[PDB]
């Protein structure tokens, strides 16, 4: 009799867990619909003005516009589209989490001369073609046989190499990176103040600056001439 | 003139191109409001919730009923959220485009005796726990070991290598490769059929499966007991 | 575990564990009743069958006359019949499942060398 | 038992078991809130404090 | 034992400076109602089994 009780208890827990999982999966579309309605309405009606009176005309048409009016229709299509968008969005977070685990690879290949090895070089690389770009490091150079390049860094990995590579395309952004350094160089007890001031005036600042758009080009032209 | 004319027009052309880009960006916000209405097309029309009897104005589409005063923080916040989502989508598209490029290495690892060219093993023996994603293989081992390892091979497979890395986590999903292959075959005909079928299925197949949804857990548990 | 061996909750534990399964089975009956109700509705809806004014109830809908509204006794009888049918169906399904277990033989006969 | 040893449900089992205790604890908060509300009501009742008309409730 | 592990977690996180608690007090409170409402979508504690398999 003891064995049967354990199996019965386990099955009940499994059923409860499955029910909870299904409820959470369903509520994910429901939570997404609630958030979308709040964003779109922000104090609006949810009677689903696309509802129809050819059926019971009680205002039961939710944000999902239940059943008859749309329902298992265009409203359900929107709900499924939102669910698909959520499934796509969570993939990015999962990818970021997996990348910052250090299983992730970031093998880089850029022109440089940094050296960290044992008794290295004295042959090195003499490629006078394909500029300074480097290809997969089996042996990058056309005639390299004893070649050894650079291993992935634990820090950053994916993204840092791409940032460095793209900085060549837009060097002005690389030059402007000093402003990003200053902003990061700001103390931790500055983000809250910056947000509060920006929230307080950001709409008003944008409104006032919208008329100021013509003034900026004159100053830019004067600076360029200067 | 000429170059001097070109030098002077550089600021003017810069202002013109920047205003064209700002028009494109505002369209991205206006078009974002358009898809917000498209989501609200499930609900219905596009009456303003932010517009109120205060600040006497007329009624219009949800984006532009006296937007600034009537829209106030709600319309601006919705626009900012939509702009952030659009920027995220653009970043995702750029990432996908860079993925299909194949410039990026995947720099993966797997156990095998294959080689792209003439590779002398010289009794390559040094194994380790977790052969996949082993040490940098710059001949990082008890000795050098006469090591030759994988370059970044040419394929739109940077994500394929990651999947193979994570494929070991769930063997059942990899076991479903037969259904994946069957779906790969005849996909244009499969798409041509399922486009209409799923639209019909989305209408009533979900409703039919809804009664079957509670039934599925009991049978699945019964089989698991075996 | 240790608490089970050191307590008499085992009978109460069985009663509680069977309560969850009994609730799930009873829900299966009402769920199937609603499913069929939608099926017969066939893209439609209805009120409770004998939902007459000679009852202090509102406009009950289909399987909504609990036990005193209208011919709820007949609604209950239909529910019981549907439950028996579902029991037979699931028993047949379980038999079919074990059918391919191989424990059972077919024990057939055919002429051959 | 055997199923626990032969399955990875243990993490999900812990999550579900803690869910019941978490629900009981959360109910304890609302239950105490209602108890105190009755206590302060002191043989009385009330409406929500700032339940103003500038809300669709 | 995991409580002892979280004790070092509290040691390094809660053992912060006033320049961190000041930010965490007020601005987080303002988002606190909104954050709680959003966490309602995760009230099913799906992230729970998420990090459970993370450890797995």
Swiss-Prot record, chains A, B:
Domain of life: Viruses
Residue spans crossing the bilayer: 8-28, 80-100, 175-195, 202-224
Family: Belongs to the orthohepadnavirus major surface antigen family.
Ranges per topology, Intravirion: 29-79, 196-201
Residues of the full protein shown: 175 to 400 of 400
Protein name: Large envelope protein
Spans within the Virion surface topological domain: 101-174, 225-226
Applications: Systematic vaccination of individuals at risk of exposure to the virus has been the main method of controlling the morbidity and mortality associated with hepatitis B. The first hepatitis B vaccine was manufactured by the purification and inactivation of HBsAg obtained from the plasma of chronic hepatitis B virus carriers. The vaccine is now produced by recombinant DNA techniques and expression of the S isoform in yeast cells. The pre-S region do not seem to induce strong enough antigenic response.
Written domain comment of the UniProt record: The large envelope protein is synthesized with the pre-S region at the cytosolic side of the endoplasmic reticulum and, hence will be within the virion after budding. Therefore the pre-S region is not N-glycosylated. Later a post-translational translocation of N-terminal pre-S and TM1 domains occur in about 50% of proteins at the virion surface. These molecules change their topology by an unknown mechanism, resulting in exposure of pre-S region at virion surface.
Post-translational modification: Isoform M is N-terminally acetylated by host at a ratio of 90%, and N-glycosylated by host at the pre-S2 region.
Function: The large envelope protein exists in two topological conformations, one which is termed 'external' or Le-HBsAg and the other 'internal' or Li-HBsAg. In its external conformation the protein attaches the virus to cell receptors and thereby initiating infection. This interaction determines the species specificity and liver tropism. This attachment induces virion internalization predominantly through caveolin-mediated endocytosis. The large envelope protein also assures fusion between virion membrane and endosomal membrane.
Annotated localization: Virion membrane
Keywords: Acetylation, Caveolin-mediated endocytosis of virus by host, Fusion of virus membrane with host endosomal membrane, Fusion of virus membrane with host membrane, Glycoprotein, Host-virus interaction, Lipoprotein, Membrane, Myristate, Transmembrane, Transmembrane helix, Viral attachment to host cell, Viral envelope protein, Viral penetration into host cytoplasm, Virion, Virus endocytosis by host, Virus entry into host cell
Phosphoprotein found in the keyword field: no
Subcellular location, principal: virion
Organism of this sequence: Hepatitis B virus genotype C subtype ayw (isolate China/Tibet127/2002) (HBV-C)
UniProtKB/Swiss-Prot annotation, chain E:
Subcellular localization, as worded in the UniProt entry: Virion membrane
Coiled-coil features, chain-numbered ranges: none
Intravirion side: 26-31
Post-translational modification remark: Isoform M is N-terminally acetylated by host at a ratio of 90%, and N-glycosylated by host at the pre-S2 region.
Biotechnology: Systematic vaccination of individuals at risk of exposure to the virus has been the main method of controlling the morbidity and mortality associated with hepatitis B. The first hepatitis B vaccine was manufactured by the purification and inactivation of HBsAg obtained from the plasma of chronic hepatitis B virus carriers. The vaccine is now produced by recombinant DNA techniques and expression of the S isoform in yeast cells. The pre-S region do not seem to induce strong enough antigenic response.
Record-annotated membrane-spanning stretches: 5-25, 32-54
Virion surface compartment spans: 55-56
Domain of life: Viruses
Role, per record: The large envelope protein exists in two topological conformations, one which is termed 'external' or Le-HBsAg and the other 'internal' or Li-HBsAg. In its external conformation the protein attaches the virus to cell receptors and thereby initiating infection. This interaction determines the species specificity and liver tropism. This attachment induces virion internalization predominantly through caveolin-mediated endocytosis. The large envelope protein also assures fusion between virion membrane and endosomal membrane.
Notes concerning its domains: The large envelope protein is synthesized with the pre-S region at the cytosolic side of the endoplasmic reticulum and, hence will be within the virion after budding. Therefore the pre-S region is not N-glycosylated. Later a post-translational translocation of N-terminal pre-S and TM1 domains occur in about 50% of proteins at the virion surface. These molecules change their topology by an unknown mechanism, resulting in exposure of pre-S region at virion surface.
Family from the record: Belongs to the orthohepadnavirus major surface antigen family.
Full protein name: Large envelope protein
């Amino acid at each position: 009799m003891e064995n049967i009780t354990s199996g019965f208890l386990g099955p009940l827990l499994v059923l409860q867990a499955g029910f909870f999982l299904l409820t959470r999966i369903l509520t994910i579309p429901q939570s997404l619909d609630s958030w979308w309605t709040s964003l779109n309405f922000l104090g609006g009606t949810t009677v689903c003005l696309g509802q129809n009176s050819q059926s019971p005309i009680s205002n039961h048409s939710p944000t999902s516009c239940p059943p008859t009016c749309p329902g298992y229709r265009w409203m359900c299509l929107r709900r499924f589209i939102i669910f698909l968008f959520i499934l796509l969005l969570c993939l990015i977070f999962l990818l970021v989490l997996l990348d910052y685990q250090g299983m992730l690879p970031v093998c880089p290949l850029i022109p440089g001369s940094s050296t960290t090895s044992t008794g290295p070089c004295r042959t090195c690389t003499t490629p006078a073609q394909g500029t300074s770009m480097y290809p997969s490091c089996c042996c990058t150079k056309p005639s390299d046989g004893n070649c050894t390049c650079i291993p992935i860094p634990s820090s950053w990995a994916f993204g840092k190499f791409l940032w460095e590579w793209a900085s060549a395309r837009f060097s002005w952004l690389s030059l402007l990176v000093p402003f990003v350094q200053w902003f990061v160089g700001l103390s931790p007890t500055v983000w809250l103040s910056v947000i509060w001031m920006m929230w307080y005036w950001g709409p008003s600042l944008y409104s006032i600056l919208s008329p100021f758009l013509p003034l900026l080009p004159i100053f830019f032209c004067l600076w360029v001439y200067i």
